[PDB]
Amino acid sequence: AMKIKIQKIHPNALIPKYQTDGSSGFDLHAVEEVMIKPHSVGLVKIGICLSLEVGYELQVRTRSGLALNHQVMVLNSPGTVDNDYRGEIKVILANLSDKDFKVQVGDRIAQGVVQKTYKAEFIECEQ
Amino acid sequence: AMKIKIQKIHPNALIPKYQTDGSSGFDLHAVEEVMIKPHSVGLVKIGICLSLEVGYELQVRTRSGLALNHQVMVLNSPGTVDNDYRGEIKVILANLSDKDFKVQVGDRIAQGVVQKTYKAEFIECEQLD
Amino acid sequence: AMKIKIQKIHPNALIPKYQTDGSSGFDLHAVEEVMIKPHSVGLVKIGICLSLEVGYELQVRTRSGLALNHQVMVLNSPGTVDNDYRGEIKVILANLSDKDFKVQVGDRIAQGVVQKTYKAEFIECEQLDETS
């Protein structure tokens, strides 16, 4: 129902798609090759800038295949993409394995899931 | 409450329950004994298949106790269970301690939390606002 | 909009703030200087107690800065803070780096994000509906 405006800023940028009508999220594909050493983090670029309908955020979520088979995950999962973030989407990927992990161009390395936001007003009590 | 059709497919499978009335999530219990060595990751069957009412997902979340005391967590936390997934629920547990971690039949190793979903419609743009 | 009642229970405690009107979460600030050894976890106190309006939970999420530059994250991210919890907000911070990581009084170490709750009722059956 909700709307996300999207700008490609890299030749390899892809418009994320839902696999099925029941998918919670959409696959995010790398636009560049990144080597990630054992026991370290890399920043993987997605080559897209998003504008989300007010009232919504994006969660950037670890893919389970990569987690189970290479101990690779989104280190800040669920990574927060704020409604007012307009820069490039990038995934912080950790390699918790003893083996190197190559992110090739096109690789699905995270998922984007749209969620509604709810802003809190704080009311201080000496209670 | 929204509804979840559940089928047990292991004798040891358990209908998940909210510990309190105020709980966000329901507890997921292992059916198989699994050992998870240091700095590695194992897969824990729960022996259930879910069908969630339409327009909802289930996030599989790390229990805070296990994380704090044993450095164990759901590696894909929050693990996405899509509305239309009908296969067995399983939890990818990682072990970041320099020690063995043992999963025993009936051990609660994660939390399922239910959430509404929202579908984006992408609109391509030369330039944003 | 929803209401959170907050009680400070530590002198260094800060009422969390949203950086902007578009922010998903408010920053959680430590009240104690603590050192977290490499490849270990630490329970970091925020020195605040929360009453969330009925129907909302809180998520405690890793800050992206600390993850990328220090391999520091919230080990149970997203940390479930249930609606009926009136204790001290504490953050389970892991240091996955091979370096000591110092938390200082006032440091932003996680983000709390209000989400709305949904309880399931389980109906058991013999066979489920099919999909693709």
CATH code of B23's domain: 2.70.40.10
Phi, psi of A50 (to 5 degrees): -115, 150
A121 lies in some domain: no
Size of chain B in residues = 129
Of B93, B6, B81, the residue nearest B41 (C-alpha): B93
Our CA-based measurement puts residue A36 at a distance from the nearest CA of chain B, in whole angstroms, of 17
C101 lies in some domain: yes
Q: Which residues of A touch B71 (CB under 8 A)?
A: none
Nearest to A62 among B75, B96, B121 (CB): B75
| Chain A, chain C: beta-carbon pairs less than 8 Å apart | 104
Residues B90, B43 contacting (CB under 8 angstroms): yes
Whether residues B96 and C96 touch (CB distance < 8 A) is answered with yes
Pairing of strands B25-29, B108-116: antiparallel
Whole-angstrom distance, CA of residue B96 vs CA of residue A97: 10
CA–CA distances in Å: residue B70 to residues A8, B64, B78, C39, C50: 43, 10, 19, 12, 27
Q: Chains contacting B with at least 3 CB pairs below 8 Å?
A: A, C
Residues A12, A105 contacting (CB under 8 angstroms): yes
Nearest to B64 among C92, C116, C121 (CB): C92
Calculate the CA C14 to chain-centre distance: 15
The residue of chain C nearest to residue A86, with distances taken between CA atoms, is C22
Return the number of other C-beta atoms located less than 10 Å from residue C107's C-beta.
17
In the DSSP assignment, the letter for residue A65 is H
B104 lies in some domain: yes
Expressed in Å, this structure's resolution amounts to: 2.5
Whether residues A73 and B76 touch (CB distance < 8 A) is answered with yes
Whole-angstrom distance, CA of residue A73 vs CA of residue A66: 7
The C-alpha angle with vertex C14 and arms to C10 and C19, in degrees rounded to 5, equals: 160
Pairing of strands C72-74, C88-95: antiparallel
Segments forming the whole domain that contains residue A112: 4-116
Q: Which two tokens stand for residue C40?
A: 């270990």
**Which residue's structure tokens are 């950037």?**
A60
Q: Chains contacting A with at least 3 CB pairs below 8 Å?
A: B, C
Would the annotation count A63 as a binding residue?
yes
**Which residue's structure tokens are 């999420």?**
C61
C28 lies in some domain: yes
Our CA-based measurement puts residue C127 at a distance from the nearest CA of chain A, in whole angstroms, of 20
Among left, alpha and beta (phi > 0; psi -120 to 50; other), residue B31 is alpha
Q: How was this structure determined?
A: X-ray
A17 lies in some domain: yes
Would the annotation count C76 as a binding residue?
yes
Our CA-based measurement puts residue A99 at a distance from the nearest CA of chain C, in whole angstroms, of 16
Whole-angstrom distance, CA of residue B39 vs CA of residue A98: 9
Whole-angstrom distance, CA of residue B118 vs CA of residue B56: 9
Of B86, B114, B115, the residue nearest B25 (C-alpha): B114
Would the annotation count C62 as a binding residue?
no
A122 lies in some domain: no
Whether residues A78 and C61 touch (CB distance < 8 A) is answered with yes
A123 lies in some domain: no
Whether residues C62 and A84 touch (CB distance < 8 A) is answered with no
Whether residues A116 and C113 touch (CB distance < 8 A) is answered with no
SS3 label, residue A98: coil
Nearest to B80 among A8, A20, A25 (CB): A25
Our CA-based measurement puts residue A32 at a distance from the nearest CA of chain C, in whole angstroms, of 18
Whole-angstrom distance, CA of residue C43 vs CA of residue B67: 10
Whole-angstrom distance, CA of residue B28 vs CA of residue B107: 8
Nearest to B3 among C41, C116, C123 (CB): C123
C121 lies in some domain: no
Number of separate domains in chain A? 1
Q: Which residues of C touch A75 (CB under 8 A)?
A: 62, 67-68, 71, 73, 96
